[PDB]
Design an enzyme around this catalytic site. Structure first.
Site, PDB file in Angstrom:
ATOM      1  N   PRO A   6     -42.035 -33.043 -17.069  1.00 29.20           N
ATOM      2  CA  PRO A   6     -40.932 -32.220 -17.576  1.00 29.20           C
ATOM      3  C   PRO A   6     -41.218 -31.586 -18.937  1.00 29.20           C
ATOM      4  CG  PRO A   6     -40.108 -34.289 -16.716  1.00 29.20           C
ATOM      5  CD  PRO A   6     -41.601 -34.417 -16.771  1.00 29.20           C
ATOM      6  N   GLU A   7     -41.904 -32.302 -19.823  1.00 34.37           N
ATOM      7  CA  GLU A   7     -42.176 -31.784 -21.161  1.00 34.37           C
ATOM      8  C   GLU A   7     -43.408 -32.410 -21.798  1.00 34.37           C
ATOM      9  OE1 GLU A   7     -41.113 -30.143 -24.269  1.00 34.37           O
ATOM     10  OE2 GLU A   7     -40.561 -28.560 -22.851  1.00 34.37           O
ATOM     11  N   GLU A  49       0.577  -8.846  -0.490  1.00 35.08           N
ATOM     12  CA  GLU A  49      -0.368  -9.847  -0.011  1.00 35.08           C
ATOM     13  C   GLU A  49      -1.670  -9.186   0.421  1.00 35.08           C
ATOM     14  OE1 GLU A  49       2.480 -10.644   3.669  1.00 35.08           O
ATOM     15  OE2 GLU A  49       0.466 -11.395   4.105  1.00 35.08           O
ATOM     16  N   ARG A  95       0.795  -1.226   0.000  1.00 36.17           N
ATOM     17  CA  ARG A  95       0.000   0.000   0.000  1.00 36.17           C
ATOM     18  C   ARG A  95       0.833   1.286   0.000  1.00 36.17           C
ATOM     19  NH1 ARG A  95      -1.379  -2.588   5.093  1.00 36.17           N
ATOM     20  NH2 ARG A  95      -0.094  -1.690   6.771  1.00 36.17           N
ATOM     21  N   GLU A 129       6.499 -15.835  19.065  1.00 32.48           N
ATOM     22  CA  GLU A 129       6.025 -15.939  20.441  1.00 32.48           C
ATOM     23  C   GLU A 129       4.532 -15.625  20.548  1.00 32.48           C
ATOM     24  OE1 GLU A 129       8.124 -13.636  19.412  1.00 32.48           O
ATOM     25  OE2 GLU A 129       6.976 -11.781  19.688  1.00 32.48           O
ATOM     26  N   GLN A 185     -36.792 -28.183 -22.774  1.00 30.50           N
ATOM     27  CA  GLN A 185     -35.766 -28.822 -21.962  1.00 30.50           C
ATOM     28  C   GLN A 185     -36.418 -29.749 -20.947  1.00 30.50           C
ATOM     29  OE1 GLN A 185     -35.297 -25.695 -18.235  1.00 30.50           O
ATOM     30  NE2 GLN A 185     -33.567 -26.051 -19.623  1.00 30.50           N
TER      31      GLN A 185
END
Ligand SMILES: [Ca+2]
Length: 880
Positions: free
Chosen positions: A806-807, A135, A86, A250, A682
């Site tokens: 479906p159809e 990063e 930055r 640490e 479809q």
């Protein structure tokens, strides 16, 4: 103080990030900090300054510039200033760039920011270079929000900094370094930044950095160590690549526990020191080399102030190691020692390439390390005619492209002076990293281009399994006296490119010393079998018979070579097997048709009949007269056809179309939005709610879009969409047309759901489910021409057993004025039954014109023009 001159950077290198808040001189308040950055050994090539930007530590910077830097430089250690990404953009916590007054987002403003940046962070304390941390944590932000304008600006400035420092800068003595966590394709700075940096440091802390991450969906390691390098291999040289591990910080929390060094024993509670390198990820990183490209620049450690400190045991992820220790940097010195025992970094010398011109070309184009020859997979171009000996080329194990250009002093080409990857082979380089299981990658054979070798007397390319001869400019090989291209995979059939090249070499040899069995060798070839790009047999006519036909073997076949030679059958291959050159065949005697032909065994089909009914059976029965459209699919891609053919059994029938697709729902006791989904073309998504309603008996009243002659119909069950459906199949069904003869159409439209009752309609077909599982039902229809229809579905189960369809397909052929054409053909039948009104001779003439129209209406090949004619002839005959 004055800058002590230092020898140019020479790997393998060791870097280390020294955290400023652990130098003694940083904070006088505390005394638990007993470490000093100046205590770093000569084994450390790069001492990085990682600073807490909220802290002042003015006493440290003075100690650094006046004592640390001279001490470190004198032993050969460089001191690098690490600054956040930055700092090159602006916005939150951007340091210098916060002052938009002097440094605006302009070309001259960015150029000024770059100068200010190196002035403040590099030259102010006379440091040895700048390290940019790229990063997520250092990303440019505006009010905590990621800023694209900032990121884009940081791509500039970076370029401007690179013009001041780095290998393309004014001051090349100052290093320009990028350290990142990103992959190359996720790093917006690497593409334009790479030419300006000396080194790229990748942070690969923990097992996730080593093994990569295990991607759940794919059951496969992602973002691996090798993949990460391969990504950056596009932008930098292997010698610029440095990988990094982390010491134990640490009081480290979850998300910052990497275990890159040996942990503390679960019983040794009083000890926080573990300077043992054995078994550590750091020790493995020191010995790790990429499989392709070349040997790496080296390794680096984060928190090098914690060198020698044991890691807190994994069991306590929610201690003695958390104390501050005075490091002697045993681990750092040990790792550098391991890298210096790496024989990969031995220089390429006169033993590798005796010819000076060749040795120079390799050093410039490939690398200077013996281990680069094991890994380089790019392009080596030899166009320096001074080259007298190609001794050493065999050292290349993975070379991709080799260009031998105008080397007129070379008299012989054989395996001893050619790359080892002339023949196919697998990766032999050992892995040192831990894995989740290492399958040896395939080493692509080197592409060989030879042109202008006018002194070449012998060319031996035998037993390399070469796929092609492309690259050999045979017309320039004017000194050829001996050739051997036997024992490869060359297609030497007449008309091929391979044959052209061979014939040219043959001609040259014949004129020089004569073509015989010892100056010309070319047999024992095993050409590779490939799948044809296109297929020729698009039509197949079969008689109506009690036979089954293998669609694949009769439509989808053929094996082609890389020279274009197509073999459609064993007979074709037998003709190929006795292609003679100098009286003998070039094809290996043990290389039969089964060894050569590709397999279509796992290919799939989709057979569609003229009523648009589909099957997936590869075997077709010809007992029924029908016309089919056959799609063929490869195992690789089941949704894309590699070949399409038409199969005609008996007389050809025109393919029908779904005249109900795109129809408009008008009424019927059903969900109007789901009802429209039976006409969408479809099967729908498995996850999609397609139920027509709540009751087990729903109806749909609709209108077709195009004038057409209906000859068939079809509806699907839910099992057509999902074989594992729990939805009950349709038990009863009715297809209906509007009774426009006895009722008014206008009344139907203005109030449709009043007419949602059988009496207003005429049933034209009825379906009663047998019982067995059926994905669909289909049936014929006798030339129906109604714009308005009604369909009733019923599962006959309990309630909440919604009819799932479906159809719905209403099939036929497009025909304008079809409703009127059937009127005049219906009137012709009515008048024929009025035998009390007309003479038999008037009826017989009418019947001829009536049977003429019906024949065209039921014609297998649907002719609209002929239908119109026969309907016009008939209509004029009925008048009067
Ligand atoms: Ca649908």
């Amino acid at each position: 103080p004055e800058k002590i001159p230092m020898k140019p950077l020479h790997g393998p290198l060791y870097g280390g990030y020294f955290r400023t808040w652990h130098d003694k001189t940083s904070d006088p308040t505390e005394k638990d900090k007993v470490n000093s950055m100046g205590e770093l050994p000569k084994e450390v090539d790069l001492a990085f300054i990682f600073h807490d930007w909220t802290k002042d530590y003015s006493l440290f910077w003075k100690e650094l510039a006046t004592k640390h830097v001279p001490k470190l430089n004198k032993q050969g250690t460089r001191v690098i200033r690490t600054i956040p990404w930055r700092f090159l953009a602006g916005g939150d916590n951007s340091g210098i760039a916060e002052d938009t007054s002097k440094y605006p987002n302009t070309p001259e403003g960015n150029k000024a920011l770059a100068k200010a940046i190196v002035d403040e962070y590099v030259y102010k304390y006379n440091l040895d270079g700048l390290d940019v941390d790229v990063e997520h944590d250092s990303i440019p932000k505006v009010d905590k929000k990621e800023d694209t304008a900032g990121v884009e600006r940081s791509i500039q400035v970076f370029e401007e900094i690179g013009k001041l420092i780095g290998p393309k800068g004014v001051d090349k003595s100052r290093l320009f370094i990028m350290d990142s966590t990103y992959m190359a394709d996720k790093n917006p700075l690497i593409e334009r930044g790479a030419p300006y940096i000396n080194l790229l440091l990748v942070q690969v802390y923990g097992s996730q950095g080593e093994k990569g991450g295990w991607e759940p969906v794919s059951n496969r390691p992602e973002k691996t160590m090798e993949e990460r390098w391969q990504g950056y291999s596009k932008y930098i040289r292997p010698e610029q690549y440095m990988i990094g591990f982390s010491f134990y910080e640490e009081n480290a929390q979850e998300g910052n526990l990497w275990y890159d060094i040996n942990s503390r024993k679960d019983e040794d509670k009083a000890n926080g020191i573990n300077t043992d390198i054995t078994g550590t990820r750091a020790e493995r990183y020191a010995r790790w080399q990429p499989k392709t490209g070349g040997v790496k620049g080296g390794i680096f450690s984060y928190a090098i102030d914690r060198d020698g400190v044991a890691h807190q045991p994994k069991k306590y992820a929610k201690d003695a190691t958390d104390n501050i220790f005075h490091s002697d940097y045993s681990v750092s010195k040990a790792l550098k020692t391991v890298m210096l025992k790496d024989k990969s970094y031995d220089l390429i010398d006169e033993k590798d390439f005796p010819d000076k011109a060749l040795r120079e070309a390799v050093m410039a184009q490939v690398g200077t390390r013996k281990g680069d020859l094991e890994r380089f997979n790019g392009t080596l171009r030899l166009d320096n005619p001074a080259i007298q000996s190609l001794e050493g080329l065999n050292k290349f194990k993975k070379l991709a492209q080799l260009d031998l250009i105008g080397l007129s002093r070379i008299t012989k080409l054989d395996r001893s002076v050619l790359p080892a990857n002339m023949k196919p082979g697998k990766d032999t380089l050992e892995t040192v990293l831990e894995t989740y299981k290492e399958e040896p990658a395939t080493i692509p054979p080197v592409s060989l281009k030879v042109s202008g070798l006018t002194g070449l007397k012998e060319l031996d390319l035998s037993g390399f399994d070469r796929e092609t001869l492309a690259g050999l400019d045979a017309a320039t090989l004017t000194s050829l006296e001996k050739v051997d291209i036997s024992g490869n995979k060359l297609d030497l059939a007449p008309g091929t490119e391979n044959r052209q090249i061979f014939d040219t070499m043959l001609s040259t040899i014949s004129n020089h010393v004569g073509s015989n069995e010892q100056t010309v060798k070319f047999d024992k070839q095993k050409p590779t079998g490939h799948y044809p790009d296109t297929y020729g047999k698009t039509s197949l006519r079969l008689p109506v018979a009690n036979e089954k036909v293998d669609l694949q073997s009769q439509l989808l076949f053929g094996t082609v070579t890389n020279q274009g030679t197509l073999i459609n059958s064993e007979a074709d291959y037998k003709a190929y097997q006795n292609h003679k050159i100098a009286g003998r065949s070039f094809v290996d005697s043990n290389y039969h048709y089964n060894n050569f032909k590709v397999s279509y065994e796992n290919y799939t089909v989709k057979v569609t009949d003229s009523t648009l009914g589909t099957t997936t059976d590869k075997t077709l029965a010809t007992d029924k007269e029908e016309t089919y459209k056959v799609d063929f699919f490869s195992p690789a891609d089941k949704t894309k056809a590699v070949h399409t053919a038409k199969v005609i059994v008996g007389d050809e029938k025109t393919m029908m179309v779904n005249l109900a697709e795109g129809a408009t729902v008008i009424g019927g006791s059903a969900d109007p939005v789901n009802a429209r989904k039976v006409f969408d073309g479809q099967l729908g998504s498995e996850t999609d709610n397609i139920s027509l309603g709540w009751d087990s008996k729903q109806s749909i009243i609709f209108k077709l879009k195009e004038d057409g002659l209906i000859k068939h119909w079809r509806f699907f069950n839910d099992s057509a969409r999902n074989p594992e459906t729990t939805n009950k199949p349709i038990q009863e069904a009715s297809l209906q047309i509007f009774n426009i003869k006895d009722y008014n159409l206008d009344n139907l439209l203005e109030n449709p759901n009043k007419f949602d009752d059988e009496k207003y309609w005429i049933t034209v077909d009825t379906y009663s489910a047998q019982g067995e599982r059926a994905t669909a039902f289909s049936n014929t229809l006798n030339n129906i021409t109604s714009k308005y229809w009604r369909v009733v579905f019923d599962t006959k189960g309990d309630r909440y057993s919604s009819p799932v369809v479906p159809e719905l397909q209403i099939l036929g052929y497009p025909l304008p004025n079809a409703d009127t054409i059937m009127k005049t053909v219906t009137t012709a039948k009515e008048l024929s039954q009025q035998k009390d009104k007309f003479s038999q001779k008037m009826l017989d003439e009418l019947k001829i014109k009536e049977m003429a129209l019906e024949t065209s209406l039921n014609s297998k090949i649907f002719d609209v023009t002929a239908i119109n004619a026969n309907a016009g002839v008939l209509k004029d005959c009925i008048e009067k």
